[PDB]
Amino acid sequence: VLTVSTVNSQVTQKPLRDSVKQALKNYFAQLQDVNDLYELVLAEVEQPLLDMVMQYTYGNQTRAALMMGINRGTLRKKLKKYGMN
Amino acid sequence: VLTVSQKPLRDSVKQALKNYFAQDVNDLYELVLAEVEQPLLDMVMQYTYGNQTRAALMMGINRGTLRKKLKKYGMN
């Protein structure tokens, strides 16, 4: 269960989606028109995911793709997309 | 651009994967994706007050994809 630790005014522990809700919330007030919010968020999440995965598997695509649950082709598509290849 | 009150959202994702990895995986992608789509759909839908037309435009996806996803997370 993906969770994130944090420190409040005085330390705490909420799921990942919360951080997402906050960023989205914060983002809206930041406006004054959006048109590619999806791809925008995906990228802000796929890359860190890729890093963590690739880091674990010492860049071993195969062993990495097997972890995320996707085929090598796709993985390569994303890496190349985020220029990590 | 997507940050939380002041670092990027990606940092949270990275830490969440850090604590998680600190424990095997088989469908990590979907795991993370759902953890990101639900709140997204939810936030956008609430933002456009249920106006799926504005929502899809805002997200950059067709009405179908939006209905598909919303339905996927029982947000229908």
UniProtKB/Swiss-Prot annotation, chain A:
InterPro entries: Fis_DNA-bd (IPR005412), Homeodomain-like_sf (IPR009057), HTH_Fis (IPR002197), Trans_regulatory_Fis (IPR050207). Activates ribosomal RNA transcription, as well other genes. Plays a direct role in upstream activation of rRNA promoters. Binds to a recombinational enhancer sequence that is required to stimulate hin-mediated DNA inversion. Prevents initiation of DNA replication from oriC. Binds to hundreds of transcriptionally active and inactive AT-rich sites, approximately half its binding sites are in non-coding DNA, which only accounts for about 10% of the genome. Pfam families: HTH_8 (PF02954). The keyword Nuclease does not apply. One of its GO terms (biological process) is response to radiation. It comes from the Bacteria. The keyword Hydrolase does not apply. It is found in: Cytoplasm, Nucleoid. This is DNA-binding protein Fis. Residues 61-80 bind DNA. Gene3D superfamilies: Homeodomain-like (1.10.10.60). Homodimer. Keywords: Activator, Cytoplasm, DNA-binding, Transcription, Transcription regulation. GO terms for molecular function: core promoter sequence-specific DNA binding; DNA binding; DNA-binding transcription activator activity; DNA-binding transcription repressor activity; protein homodimerization activity; sequence-specific DNA binding; sequence-specific DNA binding, bending; transcription cis-regulatory region binding. The gene is fis. Belongs to the transcriptional regulatory Fis family.
